[PDB]
Design a protein around this ligand. Structure first.
Ligand SMILES: [Fe+3]
Length: 344
């Protein structure tokens, strides 16, 4: 279509090269550096990814369609609704399900552990325990969620390792392996499962690396997102439309030309966007790049089309330094602190 935005190709690397340390650092800088789109697509992902993505994005629909009484049990106002379920608006009504990924570090953790300055009362949005649906209500939800997040974070750790290789060659005084260690040991990383119910300005991501699946569009009239009480076993996946109902749906990124470009994530791949904490850790050698996500227009969506998405926001622990020069930690950074121990 002549009215479409320009399509751009995201830099794409193989998981095999991330695993073996052979990934091109020039490709990495083209993906994440000052002239870049701030996004890297990873192909050759583990064999289980496609089915785990299909299942968890289906669970987003199952979860969003539960009776309101069931969803009310998952709301967590003291956590600023950044744990558990919430209804939000953008006229785009959306259900959000948030969980911290401390279980990545230790399967026994329901959340991070507090520190002298970081107690769960002044950082409840990072440190509150997860609020999981009843196992009988959404059978298999929690293990599917954990397994997919673990897969995506495993890959994020390898992307962070490549970032470290770059930073170690390019930045004097850089701590060896810093980003890898930060991502791999973070108990503040947060996953978000979004459900856009059937019926823009840019931002920067805040953390280190946001792992992304391609969105799932589902006709909920054709495959009702209903937990059949007569059917046993983990919930089967729903249908997924082979193509978006609206060609304009997807990720838009402000490019170096001044064009706002559309970027598509292959359904069988994982993408990673840089955030502000990674930009600061690398002294601006890598950049968080402004972007936004567009859904499908209602008038283009035949039937009862829902959109489900997953993002895994890897970010530092609250006490991890993000500005290595001024010694500003991620928790300070997140409270809008921009200077530290400036003399009085
Ligand atoms: Fe974003």
């Amino acid at each position: 279509g002549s009215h479409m935005a320009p399509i751009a190709q995201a830099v794409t690397v193989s998981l095999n090269d991330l695993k073996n340390g052979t990934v091109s650092l020039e490709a990495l800088e083209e993906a994440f550096g000052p002239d870049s789109l701030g996004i890297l697509v990873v192909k050759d992902v583990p064999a289980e990814f496609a089915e785990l993505r299909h299942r968890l994005l289906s669970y987003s629909s199952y979860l969003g369609n539960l009776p309101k009484s069931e969803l009310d049990r998952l709301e967590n106002e003291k956590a600023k609704y950044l744990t558990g379920w919430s209804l939000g608006k953008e006229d785009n009504l959306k259900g959000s399900y948030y969980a911290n990924c401390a279980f990545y570090v230790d399967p026994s953790l329901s959340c991070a552990k507090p520190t002298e300055e970081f107690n769960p009362d002044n950082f409840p949005e990072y440190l509150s325990p997860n609020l999981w649906p009843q196992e009988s209500t959404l059978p298999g939800f929690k293990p599917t969620f954990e397994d997919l997040c673990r897969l995506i974070i495993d890959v994020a750790v390898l992307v962070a390792r490549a970032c470290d290789r770059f930073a170690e060659k390019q930045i004097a005084g850089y701590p060896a392996g810093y980003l890898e260690g930060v991502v791999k040991t973070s108990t503040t990383t947060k996953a978000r499962l979004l459900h856009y119910f059937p019926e823009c300005a840019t931002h920067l991501d805040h953390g280190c690396l946001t792992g992304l699946t391609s969105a799932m569009f589902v006709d909920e009239a054709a495959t009702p997102p209903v937990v059949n009480p007569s059917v046993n076993g983990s919930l089967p996946p729903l249908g997924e439309l082979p193509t978006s109902p609206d060609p304009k749906a997807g990720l838009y990124i402000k490019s170096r030309t001044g064009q706002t470009v559309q970027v598509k994530i292959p359904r069988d791949c994982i993408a990673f966007q840089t955030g502000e904490a990674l930009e600061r850790i690398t002294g601006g050698k890598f950049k968080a790049v402004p972007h936004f996500v567009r859904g499908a227009r209602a008038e283009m969506s035949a039937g009862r089309i829902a959109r489900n998405t997953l993002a895994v926001f890897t970010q530092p622990n609250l006490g991890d330094e993000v500005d290595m020069e001024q010694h500003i930690t991620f928790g300070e950074f997140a409270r809008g602190i921009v200077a530290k121990n400036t003399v009085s």
